Structure 1
Amino acid sequence: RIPVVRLKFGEVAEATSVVVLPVCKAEEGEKKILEAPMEIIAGGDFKVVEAEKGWKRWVVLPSWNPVAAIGKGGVAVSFRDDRKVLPWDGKEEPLLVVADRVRNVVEADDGYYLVVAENGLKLEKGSDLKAREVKESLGMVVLVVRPPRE
């Protein structure tokens, strides 16, 4: 299905290179997802990150292959629980979903997309969305991030 990575306890501190992404909560809905800064350019000798819009919450992640590949339009969405979100098995834990809202249009049959559910926010397979005559989503899920544990 989709690539999923568990962040190691203290992996961010030991990393050589890092990406920074705006954060959204599950409860706060679709509105804050769209309002989040789209153009996140990092430059200079200090790798200073400047966004177009002001933002409140942020996440620091190591430069994973598919994550750094996004550039413009990257975002991370928080979840309290992994059950009502993941299509397959969960483990009853908080979750971060990295999305590329630049390619929000459904085209990949095997890829997964962030969509507004009749209740909150869920993850859908492209083929299932195509069945419902749904073309535009909130963005394609690039990576699912799982928390450090013992």
Structure 2
Amino acid sequence: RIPVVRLKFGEVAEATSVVVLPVCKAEEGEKKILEAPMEIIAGGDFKVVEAEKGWKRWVVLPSWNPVAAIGKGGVAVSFRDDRKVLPWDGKEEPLLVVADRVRNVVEADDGYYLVVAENGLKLEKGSDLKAREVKESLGMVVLVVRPPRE
């Protein structure tokens, strides 16, 4: 289904590589996701970066391979509760969803695509969107990040 890698406590000891994504929220809505800077210019040495647009909120994510692969068009969406967004079971915890707007076109039947739901923002299977003939989406979910816990 959706690839889910959970951030864990104590992971701050030695990250060799890390990536940065702008942050959008369920309350902020689809508009914020359109507003977020897509191209983050890497003029980096050990990371120095500039963004095409100024953005208030930034999440620092480890260079997990799916997140690293995205590059441009990478965004993180904050959800207060996991259950509403996740088609499957939830742990009643805040959810971070990484989405690639570059692949927003629905081509992957099993692929999950962030879309604007009537209630708010939801992750929808591609096949389901194809059944409703929705050719485009906000972003294609690449990874779901779960919070550190005890």
TM-score by length of 1: 0.97
* 1:111 corresponding residue in structure 2: 111
Q: In structure 1, the residue corresponding to 2:82 is in which secondary structure?
A: coil
What is the percent sequence identity of the aligned residues?
100
Q: How far apart, CA to CA, are the structure 2 residues paired with 1:10 and 1:79?
A: 23
For 1:14 and 1:122, the matched residues in 2 are separated by 34
> The residue matched to 2:84 in structure 1 has which SS?
coil
Mapped partners of 1:12, 1:49: distance in 2: 21
Q: Deviations over 1:45-79 (max 9, x none)?
A: 23112110000000001100110000110000001
Displacement of 1:8 in angstroms is 1.1
CA distance in 1, matches of 2:141, 2:6: 16
Aligned partners of 1:55, 1:113: CA distance in 2, in Å? 23
Cα displacement (A) at 1:13: 4.8
Note closer, same or farther for the CA distance 1:53–1:123 as it changes in structure 2 (3 Å cut). Answer: same
Q: Which region of structure 1 is more displaced relative to structure 2, 6-15 or 24-33?
A: 6-15
RMSD, aligned CA: 1.0
Q: Which moved more, 1:140-149 or 1:45-54?
A: 45-54
Structure that is richer in strand per residue: 1
SS of 2:33 mapped into structure 1? helix
1:28 offset after TM fit, Å? Answer: 1.0
Query: In 2, Cα distance between the equivalents of 1:51 and 1:124?
Result: 29
The TM-score, its normalising length taken from structure 2, stands at 0.97
Gaps of 5+ in 1: none
How many Å apart are 1:104 and its aligned residue?
A: 0.6
Instruction: Output the CA distance in 1 between the equivalents of 2:14 and 2:86.
Output: 29
Deviation at residue 145 of structure 1 after TM alignment = 0.1
Q: Report how far residue 83 of structure 1 moved.
A: 0.9
